[PDB]
Amino acid sequence: FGYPLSIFFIVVNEFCERFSYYGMRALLILYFTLFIGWDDNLSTAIYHTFVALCYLTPILGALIADSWLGKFKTIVSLSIVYTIGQVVLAVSSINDLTDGNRDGTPDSLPVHVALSMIGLALIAFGTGGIKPCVSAFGGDQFEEGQEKQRNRFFSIFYLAINAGSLLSTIITPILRVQQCGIHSKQACYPLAFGVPAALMAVSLIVFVIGSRMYKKFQPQGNIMAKVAKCIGFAITNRIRHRSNKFPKREHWLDWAKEKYDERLISQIKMVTRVMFLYIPLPMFWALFDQQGSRWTLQATTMNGQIGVIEIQPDQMQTVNAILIVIMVPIMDAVVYPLIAKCGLNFTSLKKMTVGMFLASMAFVAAAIVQVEIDKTLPVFPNGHEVQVKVLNIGNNSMNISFPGETMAVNQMSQTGDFMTFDVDKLSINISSTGSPVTPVTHNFEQGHRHTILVWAPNHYRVIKDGLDRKPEKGQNGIRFVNAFDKSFDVTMDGTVYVNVTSHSASEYQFFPSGKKSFTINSTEISQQCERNFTSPRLGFGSAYTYVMGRKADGCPELSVFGDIPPNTVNMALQIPQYFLLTCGEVVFSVTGLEFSYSQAPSNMKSVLQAGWLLTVAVGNIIVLIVAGAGQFSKQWAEYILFAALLLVVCVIFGIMAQFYTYVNPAE
Predict the structure, then answer these.
(1) What is the secondary structure of 598-660 as a DSSP string?
(2) In terms of CATH architecture, what is 1-220?
């Protein structure tokens, strides 16, 4: 190979940039959901504000590059700002800052969240600035060699962007969940945010110099005229005047005489036409980004596919990337067999319409899958009702008499699932074979779950659960229940249960996933029986009750009786969702960019990109004003609402496609 290695250099630049951006996105959503956790709606709102700012930035970056700075200076400065933002956010994620002085001033609102917002704003600025420059500059470098140098360029660059996304998401998710082997930090986010910063550092080192050969491009889009036109006709028509000439045509033509009256204004009219076409696109773009955000939120509460290997909450975007790559080549031949042996030809505008329809199908599938999830969800009753279960810890079976129903609870067994009763209508009676009926005498507080431990017909007690608010942001929980005459203490995974009183229950605390061993110490159980036991498979968001009874020799035996079961649905459902949304994105994006490009002069290729980015940003703002403001129901509500809006936009775009004059060899 030749000494000029610019190809490797720029493709490495692309890899690093995309890697960092997608890692940032995934961890952003899963951390705003988990660590700070203002609210799910607020989290997705902040994520979509970040995305909207990132997609609004590129036009500002191009204007700043046009104004005073140079292309190289602009790109390097924006890369530096992007790296600084990532680093400062990563520092914000870690909570420790060792200081000689003991004085700590959080500056009213927490330093954590404030530094996080500053970092995200900085990285939005940086990414928006750095995104457009590289491809255009590489094309302008040596377009002459279209024969095969240009072809190799495009191929390697495509491989690069595709890979930079996939590895990004997978590796970021993996890193996130790692208890690092350093000074005690059970945190997750510091290292995961730190990793992409190194790639930006290297890429900036990769882009240190131009190897004594580049080219300079100051003018981009002529923003002066683009604002002058608007201010001109608006001011001229607005002021109190006769306006006896043409309402909008004469002023437009006049200002064209005043300023650029040449191909400039002609092509401005040209694009103003193709853009009025873009106008209704926002919904599709809003839907794809809302997808990323709230789907990573819905995947948070599904199953995990423990299977052979856990899938991890934020790896469904990996499904998106994989399918994108695989089908992009498939689409060219299989899905376009030309006329083949049928009677239809398939046009770009109806291709975009079909893409919107496929996206609507993706979101209706999302809605039905979301409904399928609620088949198993902790209800947690509202006030004025209580939720009661009975657990047997004695050596005999009792017949528990609920109002209207009586069931027998065997030795070392529990009743069915939690049953809710009215506070005023609750009357529980306890009796066994040959024993008198003993009614319960306790004041059950409304809106709470109660467990009844019975070891004798005339002996019972009431224990409140106290988890009426789900596993909160935590994963899974556990209690311990004492069936021994004397109390015991247990240390499980380093956490110590202290003085679990006789015939009572221990309090709740959360532990990480996996099998955990515990050691139970008491004066009632001697040292000969090994007091260590290992937990059976523990799921996400679950809670279990462990009862320590007497064996034949009296040594403790394990008793697993779940109250809140682990959530189960299998991410398979996210797979149809992602297949359909992928197909949609592919066809829509490719067709639109090419058709928009085909009906425009080569001179304003950048203006179409600006329109595309503005469309995506407006869609993000729409998702913002829908998600942050509207809080009525679960994911199903806005899923259905977005599907309906997208279908309406699809039919409107079809009608618009029925009436459009196209263009010709642009002349």
Answers:
(1) HTS-GGGHHHHHHHHHHHHHHHHHHHHHHHTT--SS-HHHHHHHHHHHHHHHHHHHHHHHHS-
(2) Up-down Bundle (1.20)
